[PDB]
Design a protein around this ligand. Structure first.
Ligand SMILES: [Cl-]
Ligand SMILES: [Cl-]
Ligand SMILES: [Cl-]
Ligand code: NA
Ligand code: NA
Lengths: 134, 134, 135, 134, 134, 135
């Protein structure tokens, strides 16, 4: 079998705290920079010979993460009572991107994408990902 | 199940332009430095306890991308009329590497490889890949 | 499948070794390497704390695994007697040892629900290797 | 004596060729991706406790490199007869940034900057820089 | 003349907000992961043929940034009413390391250092530094 | 104090060594490292080709310098007997050898106009050292 992909990178800077003794000092209100990498995959190149319009990909990724950027996530109703771990946020961003694909925001071609992955890098030594089908 | 891999990195520096409104300013003649990462995978290590002869892997990758380096791909006969997107080129390189694996250029042990992936990095914020079986 | 979560943590080791076989050229001489060691843990559903694995335990257990290898000439390590300690070989060694720790509960009871592990070793800016397995 | 700085990163993708036997295969029309890092330095923080309006910094870097991006520099009258080496282009961008600072485009406070450095990365294995006082 | 240096990297994860129009959305409480690189310089290697005891360098850097880690800096008494910009924090960390050097915490040999630079990376596209003599 | 141009090229080596002195802890044992080797050449004015230095000659000569060090146990080298081959020490070794080659004309006659060089060795993702000198 075979598969093509493209990945584009953005980033966000947020505040949050975690619930649970397991988190140790991360129970305190702190924050992070996450590099946000969105990978789009598909089995065959589209009629422009690409996986997805990078302009739309970067735009739409920007639209998704723009709603999270420069925020204290502990105050965000969408996340009330939920630990906003790096892996959780990877899924949040993946799902919001997936909805934009389904809505045609990445072009009619992007309806033929097979899946996507969102990877968040919280430091030089830790990163998390969420992969899903489309 | 399980899988071993190794990856080696080379790079090329090219010019190209794209055909299609989708591309915006990339319709203009421009260029790219592509970091080219070739990943070779197999289920069991060979008789030397490796995935592939790394010297032959770098040699053969060097030979493949050497045909593209320092060129304007718009004027390359192999790509006449075709958009040489990052993802398209990743397949071109992967298939050329596979051809060399099947001709024995990466050693007889390389015929045991399960597959390969080629990843091209266009910048610090965009990259593409193609995966295939061997 | 439908989806997969993962987290990766990075450590590093600095070792000496040499290889057997003419295929290796100058690497037949005793030399060394810095390996960046990335351990990736993957699972289908987040645990009750909303994470893939307790990061504190993941880094501790990865630290303990690679600490046994660090600052050593692997050519004189009994565990690797007669074997080429290639980057890809070492990735499996580290992966398998991490797995053993997962299976003894050392990364938390939740870690028993992990789907798999990948270990990637980076020997330089231009060569890296990996091993992927199920748990 | 002490010094503060901040650095912001952008990138361009261009085509060019070089004149002279010294350049070997780079005498052919090809191209490159340059990561462009602009460093602004000052001896004392301004009244907002910063080196420079980072927003204006990232915007102004964007403006400057925007005039170069997605172009064959061989066709740019500004560079007629001149080798557009990585080090030369670092100077071009530094000089254009300097003029923007003088004109007030990075804010009145940016005239208190001591100097700047522009670094262009043409690959994972080569980069060039130009440093100048303001 | 000539100069030796060594650099060690640590990181912290913090929350903060800024005061001032210039900051735009960064006036909201957010956060950052800062990669913290401490550079120690000297003219001649010490008796062990090094710039500084790297164990003590990392230990002392660890102690300095450990007092900042996992905190909302807006609520830290040390920074009350002050914008905790990347560049300002670089100086805070440099000065705290200098104090430790002068009390002998990096070894008696470290009293021979010429200077320090601390660089904080807020993302893949923005970083700041502060340089001082010892 | 007006301005300065520079170019940097990257190579790497993979070596074994040990350190002498209790200060070094486990690094007193024979181990190894991958050093990414960055050579920076600086000058005030571009040459007649509009460059800092012939990049082909810079990479060739850096490659020649590091090649003499590569895939070796540096503990065995007579020139380094009695000397801890720390990252910072090796940066100067490489810088001094590059300087010799500049001064012999091996990087082109233009390179005689260089103001200086810096060599930076990266031993891991979290430690690096440099040596800066005039030419
Ligand atoms: Cl939760
Ligand atoms: Cl096409
Ligand atoms: Cl302030
Ligand atoms: Na709390
Ligand atoms: Na579909």
């Amino acid at each position: 079998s075979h598969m093509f992909s493209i990945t584009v990178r953005d980033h966000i800077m947020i505040a949050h705290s975690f619930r649970g003794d397991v988190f140790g000092p991360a129970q305190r209100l702190h924050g992070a920079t996450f590099l946000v990498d969105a990978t789009f995959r598909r089995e065959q190149l589209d009629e422009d010979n690409i996986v997805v319009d990078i302009g739309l990909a970067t735009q739409e990724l920007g639209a998704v993460v723009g709603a999270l950027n420069y925020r204290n996530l502990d105050n965000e109703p969408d996340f009330a009572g939920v630990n906003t771990s790096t892996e959780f946020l990877a899924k949040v961003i993946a799902d919001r991107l997936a909805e934009r694909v389904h809505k045609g925001a990445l072009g009619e071609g992007a309806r033929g994408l097979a899946g996507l992955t969102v990877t968040l890098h919280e430091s030089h030594v830790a990163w998390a990902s969420y992969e899903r089908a489309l």
